[PDB]
Amino acid sequence: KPHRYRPGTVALREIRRYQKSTELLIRKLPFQRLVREIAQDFKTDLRFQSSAVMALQEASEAYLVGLFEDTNLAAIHAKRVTIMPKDIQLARRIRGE
């Protein structure tokens, strides 16, 4: 029998690894494609500094980890551990938008 870790153990190992980690968690070129796409929605043929793509990356992921920290608090509030769309809607409604 091949060895199999229990559900959640590899999840906690990912948690510990990625809290210890500091690197980017998004592939950079599809992110750049997406931000050029949404820039084209508002103004055509805009150009991006690669550092500007990195800044939008880090601000975006910081926003996401703040929202996910909020939804973890919402999930442990709801006697649960699986985060739900109602948790994300709650966190955004609390934060005032």
Binding site: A11, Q19, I26, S60, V65, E69, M84
Partner: protein
Amino acid sequence: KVLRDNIQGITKPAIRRLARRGGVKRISGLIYEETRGVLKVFLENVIRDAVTYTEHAKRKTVTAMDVVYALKRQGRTLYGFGG
């Protein structure tokens, strides 16, 4: 030239890595498209501002300086590219 679907380019395991950075253990299957949506909406919120500075500057190229200015306008001030 024109791009139609790169919101799916932010992959589901990449969102999983982000949520592990957020300390999430268990993520529902309906979460990922909603995270795409809220990151999307946040990108209009940021980039309309950033494009607005850019068109004030009579420029065509997005700079990180205006990214910092847009993020600090919303009270989410970003260290690491100002100055």
